[PDB]
PDB file of C-alpha atoms in Angstrom:
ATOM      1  CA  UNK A   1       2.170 -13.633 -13.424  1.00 57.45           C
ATOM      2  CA  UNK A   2       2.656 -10.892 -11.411  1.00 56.31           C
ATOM      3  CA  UNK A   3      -0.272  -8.384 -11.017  1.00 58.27           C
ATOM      4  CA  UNK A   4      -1.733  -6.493  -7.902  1.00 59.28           C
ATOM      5  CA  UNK A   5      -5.212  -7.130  -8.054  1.00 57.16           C
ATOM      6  CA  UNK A   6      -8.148  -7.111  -5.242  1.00 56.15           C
ATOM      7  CA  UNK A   7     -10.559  -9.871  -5.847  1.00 55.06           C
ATOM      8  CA  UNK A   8      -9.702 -12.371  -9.008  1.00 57.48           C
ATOM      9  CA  UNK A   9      -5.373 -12.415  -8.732  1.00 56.68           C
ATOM     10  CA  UNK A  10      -4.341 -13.745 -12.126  1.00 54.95           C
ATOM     11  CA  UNK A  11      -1.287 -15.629 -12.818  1.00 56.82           C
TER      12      UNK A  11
ATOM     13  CA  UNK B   1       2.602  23.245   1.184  1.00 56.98           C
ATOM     14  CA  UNK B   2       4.811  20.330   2.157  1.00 58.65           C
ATOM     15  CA  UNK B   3       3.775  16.520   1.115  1.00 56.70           C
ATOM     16  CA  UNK B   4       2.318  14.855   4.532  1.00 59.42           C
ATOM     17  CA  UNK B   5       4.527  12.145   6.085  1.00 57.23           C
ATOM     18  CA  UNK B   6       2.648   8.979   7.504  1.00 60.76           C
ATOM     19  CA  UNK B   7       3.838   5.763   9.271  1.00 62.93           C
ATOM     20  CA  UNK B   8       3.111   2.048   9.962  1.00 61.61           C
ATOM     21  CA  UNK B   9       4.383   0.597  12.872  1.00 64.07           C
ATOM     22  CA  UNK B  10       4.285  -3.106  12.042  1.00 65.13           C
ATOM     23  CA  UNK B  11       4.412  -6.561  13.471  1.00 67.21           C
ATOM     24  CA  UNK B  12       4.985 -10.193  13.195  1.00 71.63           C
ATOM     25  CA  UNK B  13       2.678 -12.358  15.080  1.00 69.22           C
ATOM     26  CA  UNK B  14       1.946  -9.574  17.710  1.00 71.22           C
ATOM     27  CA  UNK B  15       5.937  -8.721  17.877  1.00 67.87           C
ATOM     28  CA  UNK B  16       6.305  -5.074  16.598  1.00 63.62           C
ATOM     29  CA  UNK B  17       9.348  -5.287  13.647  1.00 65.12           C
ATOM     30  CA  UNK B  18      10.078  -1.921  13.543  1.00 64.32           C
ATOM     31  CA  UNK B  19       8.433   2.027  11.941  1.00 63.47           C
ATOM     32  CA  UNK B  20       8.323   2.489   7.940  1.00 66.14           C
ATOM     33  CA  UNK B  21       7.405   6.027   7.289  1.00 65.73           C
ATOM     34  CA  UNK B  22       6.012   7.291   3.700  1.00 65.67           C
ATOM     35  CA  UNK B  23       6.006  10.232   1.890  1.00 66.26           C
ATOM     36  CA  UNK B  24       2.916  10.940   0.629  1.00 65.32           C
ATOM     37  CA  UNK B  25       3.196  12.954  -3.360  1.00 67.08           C
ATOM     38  CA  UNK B  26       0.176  15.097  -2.438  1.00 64.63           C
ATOM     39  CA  UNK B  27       1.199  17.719  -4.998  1.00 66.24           C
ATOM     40  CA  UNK B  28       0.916  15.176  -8.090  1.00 68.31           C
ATOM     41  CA  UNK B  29      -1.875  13.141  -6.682  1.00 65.41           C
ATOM     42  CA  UNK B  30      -3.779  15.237  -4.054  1.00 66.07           C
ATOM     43  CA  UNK B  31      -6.681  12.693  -3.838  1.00 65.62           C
ATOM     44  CA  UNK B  32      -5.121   9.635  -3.746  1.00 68.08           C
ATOM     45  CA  UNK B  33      -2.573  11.024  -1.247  1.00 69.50           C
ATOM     46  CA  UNK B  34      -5.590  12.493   0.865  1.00 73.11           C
ATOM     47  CA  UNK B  35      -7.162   8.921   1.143  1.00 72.10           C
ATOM     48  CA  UNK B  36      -4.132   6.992   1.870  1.00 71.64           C
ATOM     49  CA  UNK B  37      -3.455   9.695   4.671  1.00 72.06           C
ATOM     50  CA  UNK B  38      -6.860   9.916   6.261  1.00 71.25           C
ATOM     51  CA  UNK B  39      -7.407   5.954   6.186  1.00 72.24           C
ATOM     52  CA  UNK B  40      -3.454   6.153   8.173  1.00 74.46           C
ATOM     53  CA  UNK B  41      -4.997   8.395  10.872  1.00 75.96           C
ATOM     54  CA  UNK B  42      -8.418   6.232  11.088  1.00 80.58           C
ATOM     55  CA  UNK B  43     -10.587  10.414  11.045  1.00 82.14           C
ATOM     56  CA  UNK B  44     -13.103   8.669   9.656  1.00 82.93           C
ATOM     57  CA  UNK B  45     -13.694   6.193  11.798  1.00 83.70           C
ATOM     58  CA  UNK B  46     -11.854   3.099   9.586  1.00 80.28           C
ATOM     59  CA  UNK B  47      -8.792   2.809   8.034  1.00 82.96           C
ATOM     60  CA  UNK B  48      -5.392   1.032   8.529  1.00 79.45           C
ATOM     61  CA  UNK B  49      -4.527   0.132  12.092  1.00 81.43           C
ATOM     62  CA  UNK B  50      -4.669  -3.560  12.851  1.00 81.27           C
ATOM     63  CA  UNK B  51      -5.074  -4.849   9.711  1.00 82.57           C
ATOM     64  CA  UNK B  52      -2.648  -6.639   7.572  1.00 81.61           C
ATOM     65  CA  UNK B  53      -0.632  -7.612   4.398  1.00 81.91           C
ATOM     66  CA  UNK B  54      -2.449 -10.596   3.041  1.00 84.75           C
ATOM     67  CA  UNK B  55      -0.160 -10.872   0.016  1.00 81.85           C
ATOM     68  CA  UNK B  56       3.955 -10.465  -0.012  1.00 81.05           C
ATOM     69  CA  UNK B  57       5.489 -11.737  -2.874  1.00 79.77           C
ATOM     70  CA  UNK B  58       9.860 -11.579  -2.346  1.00 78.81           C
ATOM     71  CA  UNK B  59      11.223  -9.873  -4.959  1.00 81.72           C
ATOM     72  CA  UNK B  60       8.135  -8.066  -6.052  1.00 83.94           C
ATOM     73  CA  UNK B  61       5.855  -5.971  -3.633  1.00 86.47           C
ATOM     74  CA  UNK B  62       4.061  -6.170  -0.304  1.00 88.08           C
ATOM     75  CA  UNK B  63       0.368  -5.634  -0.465  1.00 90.00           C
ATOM     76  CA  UNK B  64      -2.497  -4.339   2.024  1.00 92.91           C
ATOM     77  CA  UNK B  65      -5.023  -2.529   3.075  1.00 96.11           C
ATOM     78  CA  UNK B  66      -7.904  -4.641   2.954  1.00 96.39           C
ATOM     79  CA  UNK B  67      -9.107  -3.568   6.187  1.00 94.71           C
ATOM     80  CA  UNK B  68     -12.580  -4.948   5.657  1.00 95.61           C
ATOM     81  CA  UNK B  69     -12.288  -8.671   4.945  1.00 96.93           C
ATOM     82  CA  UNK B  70      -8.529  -9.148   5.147  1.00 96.66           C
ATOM     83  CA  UNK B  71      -7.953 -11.291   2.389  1.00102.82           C
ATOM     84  CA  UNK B  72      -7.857  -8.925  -0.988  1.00101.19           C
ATOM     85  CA  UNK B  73     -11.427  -8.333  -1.595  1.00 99.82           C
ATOM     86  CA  UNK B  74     -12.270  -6.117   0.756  1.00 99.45           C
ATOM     87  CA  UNK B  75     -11.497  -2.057   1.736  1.00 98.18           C
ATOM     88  CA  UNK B  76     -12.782   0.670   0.638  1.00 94.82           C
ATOM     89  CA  UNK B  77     -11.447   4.492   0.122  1.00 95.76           C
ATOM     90  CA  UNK B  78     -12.767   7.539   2.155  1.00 95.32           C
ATOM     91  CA  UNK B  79     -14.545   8.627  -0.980  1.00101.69           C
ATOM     92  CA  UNK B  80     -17.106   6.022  -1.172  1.00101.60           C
ATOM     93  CA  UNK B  81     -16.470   2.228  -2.158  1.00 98.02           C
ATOM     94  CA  UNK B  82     -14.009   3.473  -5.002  1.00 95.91           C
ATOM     95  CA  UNK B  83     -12.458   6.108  -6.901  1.00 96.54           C
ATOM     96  CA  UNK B  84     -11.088   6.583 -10.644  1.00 95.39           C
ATOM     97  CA  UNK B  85      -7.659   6.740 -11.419  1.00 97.28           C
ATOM     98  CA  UNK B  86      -6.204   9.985 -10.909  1.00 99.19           C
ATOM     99  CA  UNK B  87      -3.445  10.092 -13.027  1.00 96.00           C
ATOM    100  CA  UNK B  88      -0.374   7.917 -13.936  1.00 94.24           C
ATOM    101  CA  UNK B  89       2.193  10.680 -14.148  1.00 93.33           C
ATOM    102  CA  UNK B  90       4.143   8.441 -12.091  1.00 94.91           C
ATOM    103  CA  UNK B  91       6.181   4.903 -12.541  1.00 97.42           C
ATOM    104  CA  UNK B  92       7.014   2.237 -10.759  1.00 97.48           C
ATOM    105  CA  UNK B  93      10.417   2.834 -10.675  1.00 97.47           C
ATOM    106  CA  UNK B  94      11.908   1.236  -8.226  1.00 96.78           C
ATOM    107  CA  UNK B  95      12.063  -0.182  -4.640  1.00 98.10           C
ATOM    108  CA  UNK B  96      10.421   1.979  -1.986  1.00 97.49           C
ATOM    109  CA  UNK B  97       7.201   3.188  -4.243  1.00 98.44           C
ATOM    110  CA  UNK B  98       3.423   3.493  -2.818  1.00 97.04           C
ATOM    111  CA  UNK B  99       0.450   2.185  -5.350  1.00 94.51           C
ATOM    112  CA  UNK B 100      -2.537   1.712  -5.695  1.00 93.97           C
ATOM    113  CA  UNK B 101      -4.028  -2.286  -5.986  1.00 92.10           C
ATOM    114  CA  UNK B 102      -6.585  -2.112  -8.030  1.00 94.30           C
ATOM    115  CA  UNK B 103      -9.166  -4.473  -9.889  1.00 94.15           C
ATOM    116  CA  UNK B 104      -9.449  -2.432 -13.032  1.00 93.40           C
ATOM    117  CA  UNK B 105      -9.947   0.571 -14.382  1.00 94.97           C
ATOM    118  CA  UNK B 106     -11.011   3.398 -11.550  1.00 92.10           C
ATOM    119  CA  UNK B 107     -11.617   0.929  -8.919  1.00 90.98           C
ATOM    120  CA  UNK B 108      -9.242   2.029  -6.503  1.00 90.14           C
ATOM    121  CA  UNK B 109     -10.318   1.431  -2.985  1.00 91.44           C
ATOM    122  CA  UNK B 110      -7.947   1.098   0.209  1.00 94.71           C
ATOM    123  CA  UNK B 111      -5.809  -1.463  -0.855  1.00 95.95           C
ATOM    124  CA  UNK B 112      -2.190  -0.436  -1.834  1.00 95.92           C
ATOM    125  CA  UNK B 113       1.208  -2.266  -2.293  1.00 96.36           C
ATOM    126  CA  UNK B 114       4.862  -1.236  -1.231  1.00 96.00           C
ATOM    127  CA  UNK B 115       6.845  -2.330  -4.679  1.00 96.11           C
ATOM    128  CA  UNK B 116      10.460  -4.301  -3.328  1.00 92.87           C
ATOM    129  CA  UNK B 117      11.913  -3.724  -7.349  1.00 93.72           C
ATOM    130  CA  UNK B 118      11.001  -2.135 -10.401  1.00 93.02           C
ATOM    131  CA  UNK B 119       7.735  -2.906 -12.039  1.00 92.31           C
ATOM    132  CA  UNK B 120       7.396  -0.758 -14.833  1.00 90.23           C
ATOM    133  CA  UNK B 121       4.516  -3.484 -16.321  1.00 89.46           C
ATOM    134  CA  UNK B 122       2.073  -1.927 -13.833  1.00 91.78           C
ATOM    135  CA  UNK B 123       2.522   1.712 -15.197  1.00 94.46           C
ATOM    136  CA  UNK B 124      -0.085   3.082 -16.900  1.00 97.09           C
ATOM    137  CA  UNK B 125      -2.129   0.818 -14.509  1.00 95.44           C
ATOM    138  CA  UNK B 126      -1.643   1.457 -10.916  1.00 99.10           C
ATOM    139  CA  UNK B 127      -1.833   5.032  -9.822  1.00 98.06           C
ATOM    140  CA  UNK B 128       1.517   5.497  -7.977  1.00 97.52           C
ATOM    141  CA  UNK B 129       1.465   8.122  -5.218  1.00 95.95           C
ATOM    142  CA  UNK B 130       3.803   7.732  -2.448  1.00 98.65           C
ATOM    143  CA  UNK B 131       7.322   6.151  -1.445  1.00 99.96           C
ATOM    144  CA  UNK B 132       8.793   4.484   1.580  1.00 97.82           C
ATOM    145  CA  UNK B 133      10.993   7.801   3.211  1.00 95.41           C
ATOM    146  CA  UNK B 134      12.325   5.724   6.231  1.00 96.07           C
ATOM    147  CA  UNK B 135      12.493   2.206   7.457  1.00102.75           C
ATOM    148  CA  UNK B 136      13.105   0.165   3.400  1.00106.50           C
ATOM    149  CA  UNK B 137      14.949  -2.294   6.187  1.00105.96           C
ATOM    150  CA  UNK B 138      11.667  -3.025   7.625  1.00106.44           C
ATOM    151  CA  UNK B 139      10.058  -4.010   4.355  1.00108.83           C
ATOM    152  CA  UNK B 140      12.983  -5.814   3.523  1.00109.20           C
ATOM    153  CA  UNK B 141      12.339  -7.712   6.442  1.00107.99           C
ATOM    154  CA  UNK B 142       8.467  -8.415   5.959  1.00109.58           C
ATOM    155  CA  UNK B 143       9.432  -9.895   2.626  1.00110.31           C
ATOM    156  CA  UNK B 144      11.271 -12.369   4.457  1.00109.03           C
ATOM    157  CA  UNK B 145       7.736 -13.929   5.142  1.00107.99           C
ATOM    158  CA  UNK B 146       6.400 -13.730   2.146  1.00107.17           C
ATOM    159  CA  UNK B 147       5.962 -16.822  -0.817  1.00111.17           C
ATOM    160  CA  UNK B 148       5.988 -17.181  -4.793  1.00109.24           C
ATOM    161  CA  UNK B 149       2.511 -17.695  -4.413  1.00109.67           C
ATOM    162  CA  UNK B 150       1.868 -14.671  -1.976  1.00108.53           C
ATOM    163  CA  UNK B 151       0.985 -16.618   1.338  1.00108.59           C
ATOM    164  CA  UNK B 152       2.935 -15.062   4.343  1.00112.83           C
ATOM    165  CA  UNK B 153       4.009 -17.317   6.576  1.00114.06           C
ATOM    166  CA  UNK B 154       3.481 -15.234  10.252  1.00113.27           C
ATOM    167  CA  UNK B 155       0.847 -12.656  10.263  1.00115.44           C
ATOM    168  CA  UNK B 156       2.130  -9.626   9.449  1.00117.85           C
ATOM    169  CA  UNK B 157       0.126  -6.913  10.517  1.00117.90           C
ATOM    170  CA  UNK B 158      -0.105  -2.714  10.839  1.00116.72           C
ATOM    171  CA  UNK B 159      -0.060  -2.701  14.848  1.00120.16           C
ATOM    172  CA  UNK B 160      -0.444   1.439  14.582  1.00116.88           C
ATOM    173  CA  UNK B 161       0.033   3.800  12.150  1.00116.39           C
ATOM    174  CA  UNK B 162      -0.886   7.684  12.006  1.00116.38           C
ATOM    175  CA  UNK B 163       1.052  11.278  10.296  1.00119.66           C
ATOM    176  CA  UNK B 164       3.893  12.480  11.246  1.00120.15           C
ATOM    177  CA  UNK B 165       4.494  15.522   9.049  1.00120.64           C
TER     178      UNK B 165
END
């Protein structure tokens, strides 16, 4: 999808 | 009291692209601000300057800051590993804003993203703090190498950076 992680990025 | 200004001077594959300059919204979020600004200037003896954006996503944002292990799971702020989340008076309103990646709740370390359109899923979730003041040209180019999937395609990286104002 469309997140702004650090570490695991999910869909 | 004025906000501070800070800039990245970045590059493509060693080739500097041009200057993007930021205002910093010290006077909503003075501690976020204060990291992002002190990690531009390297005082501390780490920060910004040569690393790069591991993840640029056209249409959607540019992210970095992972000056540690370059790839997303690294950084840290100039607080410690990480910080809470300071506030979310602001959105993501539009091209041009500064936030905060994060991996959850109060986990904010060094890692930020420059937002190329409005994202208003992420408020409430990223702490915004900042927007592009000059140079939206240059991160309109960087985007340019970017993917669906986030891979750049050239390395795209902060050759300098420091304040201005």
């Amino acid at each position: 999808x469309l997140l702004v992680t650090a570490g695991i990025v999910l869909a | 009291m004025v906000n501070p200004t800070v800039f990245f001077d970045i590059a493509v594959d060693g080739e500097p692209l041009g200057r993007v300059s930021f205002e910093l919204f010290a006077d909503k979020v003075p501690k976020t601000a204060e990291n992002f600004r002190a990690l531009s200037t390297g005082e501390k003896g780490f920060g910004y300057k040569g690393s790069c954006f591991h993840r640029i996503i056209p249409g959607f944002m540019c992210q970095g800051g992972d000056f540690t292990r370059h790839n997303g799971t690294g950084g840290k702020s100039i607080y410690g590993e990480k910080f809470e989340d300071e506030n979310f008076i602001l959105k993501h309103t539009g091209p041009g804003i500064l936030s905060m990646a994060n991996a959850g709740p109060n986990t904010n370390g060094s890692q930020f993203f420059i937002c190329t359109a409005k994202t208003e899923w992420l408020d409430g979730k990223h702490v915004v703090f900042g927007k592009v003041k000059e140079g939206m040209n240059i991160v309109e180019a960087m985007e340019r190498f970017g993917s669906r999937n986030g891979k750049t395609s050239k390395k795209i990286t902060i050759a300098d950076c420091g304040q201005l104002e």
